[PDB]
Design a binder for these strands. Structure first.
Ligand code: MG
Ligand code: MG
Ligand code: MG
Ligand code: MG
Ligand code: MG
Ligand code: MG
Ligand code: MG
Ligand code: MG
Ligand code: MG
Lengths: 233, 207, 118
RNA sequence: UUAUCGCGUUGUUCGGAGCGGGGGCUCAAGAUUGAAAAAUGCAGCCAUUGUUGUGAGUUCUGCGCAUUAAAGCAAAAACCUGGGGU
RNA sequence: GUUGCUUCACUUAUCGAAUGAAGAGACCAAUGGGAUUAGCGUAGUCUUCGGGCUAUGCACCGUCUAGGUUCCAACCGUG
RNA sequence: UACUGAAAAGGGGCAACAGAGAACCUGGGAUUAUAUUCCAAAAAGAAAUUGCAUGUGGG
């Protein structure tokens, strides 16, 4: 007649019932590589960072980043199969006509690779340059904003070499340059250049002098605030 | 010349501690969350003697804080400890002989033993038989306590260091004359190879 | 990979592929019908051995010193159509292994000795 | 239901935290029945015989885990029982 | 404007200790952060005309609690 | 049906033929010489113990 179902709660205070298994992630001993790759980020935050390196933490926004990556994606370079098919068709054309030009120029695309991008910047063929912000070792691209400023080339610093590599069809890219586009994308390129110039080229005086780092941890900040409040008066 | 005996003893060799019959090291329990915020209650299970040591040792049983099992601790016992006694260790613990408290909670003028110089080292000062420390004063601005040591020196320690209340048992051991060479032989048999002692003027210039 | 309940990290469990059986590296032809001839070398004809044949139904052999009692029994069954109820062994001071073999009393050790030729 | 009193050892002790008496429950070490086992062994010669008691000495064992002691008397495998839930 | 010596408050190098790296700190809020959590005003100033820098406001990241008191609520308190 | 994948902090091994551990006893007319090791169906015989399978009773 009477259900024997009942609540039988447990007490989890000190010296009481055995507790459930808590999450120990923040207090466990991790592998060495995990610990070191976290402490490296902390140390990069706490020290005084010179402007030449600090400029790489000030990236382009989300919307312009997405738009530029879309443009690069639509002008991606041709793949192994596509190159083979085009060359085979050129070969059959030459076979049927032993005379006549062949026009083996390949379709218009973006310039990729550090050597070729540096050459395009130095010869002032590039209309716009995009640089990844996390290349290791960083000396590979540390001088590129200075070169672009010296030659008056529009440039931006964006968030991931992996995203650049996805746009161009590889695993990773350090930098990418647009030298020319079709007639239908001229407006897109001009507006992108305007936004990029607003963020980077037109703020050169600030970018060349601003320092970074010197960021306390949250626990240090809270201690400082509570002490200031306590000693008021 | 040849190597002097005091330098030879540093190689180890036949002059190390005779430890086969000893029980483990004697320590307080670990300074964990329960001790920092509440208290723990253990039961004294046995009082024993170990070779080489004048004081008595106590085996104390606690419950494990995280698992279903029992934990046994081995401490240096104060005078008056008895089997079946309840022992309290932690932040909120009453003033009674054998309890373990943070130094900042013990009123000035109290007599303590098993004091840790730095918090969490599990006891390093006033451990030999019959010895103790006296609490002189607290300082709340800097959180530090002043102590008088058995030697008669004064020392300042953090007020979060722990100490047991009472005096080490087995006192008065050195007041009975030994009278025989064989008694010294048996006394050092449990410690190490350091007896009998030959005077330096009885040796030769080479050594 | 979400919530760890231990104070130290231990290695996670991953998929392991078992090893493959390679083609054999030993290709010498070994006949399986001649091993008993390696196991059992020849009989002994000393005075003690002769005394054991008649009164205890026992035969004495020199055998391969790395052989054991079970394989000596099986070799006896293969070489002669007899059943051994007991094998005792010793290693002699000259290095050879000797076996005392008792037959099951449904066979005559004397007749087996006559067939063997000793 | 005992008390100044009783119980006990060669011996340095035990009792209202339960002495002694009447009845029991258990553990250790012996004993006594049988089975094995006379079918064996020994000694005189197809037959005979065939052993039961007392002292002394012996460290197994029991006196359970109080020798000097500022000396206080190894460890583990393997195994046993219980508390829990299955 | 540099340089030396030196006081004090800090923490990330380094040093000592403990632990089977077993419960740190906040939520109680700034002399704090931000365009991918800087969004919006005010003043000056600069600009490659797209927007910046400096100063001071307003937002947002912003939150829950045993107990002690006086249905809510509030004040204490701090896991 | 192998496969597959939850728990259990603290790598692998050696070091005692007097420590720990360890299921068997007597008889023999049974040797030139070995025996708690050999003895043959009346095993002279009487046991204890380990592994795996039968069946009988009980779960
Ligand atoms: Mg040592
Ligand atoms: Mg001399
Ligand atoms: Mg000299
Ligand atoms: Mg053998
Ligand atoms: Mg004795
Ligand atoms: Mg070994
Ligand atoms: Mg042994
Ligand atoms: Mg053996
Ligand atoms: Mg002999």
């Amino acid at each position: 007649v009477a259900s024997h179902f009942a609540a039988r709660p447990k007490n989890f205070g000190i010296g009481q019932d055995v507790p459930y298994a808590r999450d120990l992630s923040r207090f466990m001993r991790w592998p060495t590589f995990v610990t070191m790759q976290r402490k490296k980020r902390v140390l990069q935050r706490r020290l005084k960072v010179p402007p030449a390196l600090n400029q790489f933490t000030k990236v382009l926004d989300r919307a312009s980043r997405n738009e530029a990556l879309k443009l690069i994606k639509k002008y991606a370079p041709e793949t192994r199969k596509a190159r083979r098919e085009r060359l085979q068709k050129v070969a059959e054309e030459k076979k049927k006509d032993p005379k006549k030009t062949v026009s083996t120029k390949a379709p218009l695309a973006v310039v990729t690779g550090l050597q070729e991008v540096t050459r395009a910047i130095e010869k002032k063929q590039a209309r716009m340059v995009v640089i990844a912000n996390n290349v290791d070792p960083v000396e590979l691209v540390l001088w590129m904003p200075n070169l672009c400023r010296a030659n008056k080339i529009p440039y931006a610093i964006v968030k991931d070499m992996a995203r650049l590599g996805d746009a161009i069809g590889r695993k990773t890219a350090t930098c990418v340059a647009l030298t020319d586009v079709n007639a239908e994308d001229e407006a897109t390129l001009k507006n992108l250049i305007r936004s990029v110039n607003a963020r980077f080229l037109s703020r050169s005086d600030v970018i060349r002098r601003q320092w970074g780092g010197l960021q306390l941890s949250l626990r240090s900040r809270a201690e400082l605030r509570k002490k200031h409040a306590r000693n008021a008066g | 010349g040849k190597t002097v005996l005091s330098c030879r003893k540093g190689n180890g060799s036949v002059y190390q501690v005779h430890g086969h019959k000893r029980l483990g090291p004697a320590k307080l329990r670990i300074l964990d969350y329960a001790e920092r915020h509440g208290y723990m209650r253990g039961v004294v299970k046995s009082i024993e003697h170990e070779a080489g040591r004048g004081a008595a040792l106590a085996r104390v049983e606690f419950r494990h804080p995280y698992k279903f099992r029992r934990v046994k601790e081995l401490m240096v016992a104060p005078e008056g400890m008895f089997t079946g006694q309840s022992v309290f260790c932690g932040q909120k613990a009453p003033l009674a002989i054998g309890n373990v408290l943070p130094l900042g909670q013990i009123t000035e003028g109290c007599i303590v033993c098993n004091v840790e110089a730095k918090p969490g080292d599990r006891g390093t000062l006033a451990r030999a038989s019959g010895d103790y420390c006296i609490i002189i004063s607290h300082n709340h601005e800097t959180g530090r306590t002043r102590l008088k040591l058995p030697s008669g020196q004064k020392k300042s320690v953090p007020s979060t260091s722990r100490a047991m209340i009472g005096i080490i048992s087995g006192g008065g051991r050195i007041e009975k004359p030994v009278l025989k060479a064989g008694n010294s032989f048996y006394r050092f048999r449990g410690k190490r190879n350091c007896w009998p002692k030959v005077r330096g003027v009885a040796r030769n210039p080479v050594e | 990979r979400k919530s760890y309940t231990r104070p130290q990290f231990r290695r996670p469990h991953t998929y392991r592929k078992p090893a493959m059986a390679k083609p054999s590296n030993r290709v010498t032809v070994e006949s399986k019908d001649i091993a008993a001839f390696n196991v059992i070398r020849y009989p002994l004809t000393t005075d003690k051995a002769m005394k054991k044949i008649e009164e205890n139904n026992t035969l004495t052999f020199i055998v391969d010193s790395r052989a054991n009692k079970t394989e000596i029994k099986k070799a006896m069954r293969k070489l002669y159509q007899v059943k051994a109820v007991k094998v005792n062994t010793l290693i002699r001071p000259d290095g050879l292994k000797k076996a005392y073999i008792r037959l099951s009393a449904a066979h005559d050790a004397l007749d087996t000795a006559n067939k063997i030729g000793l």
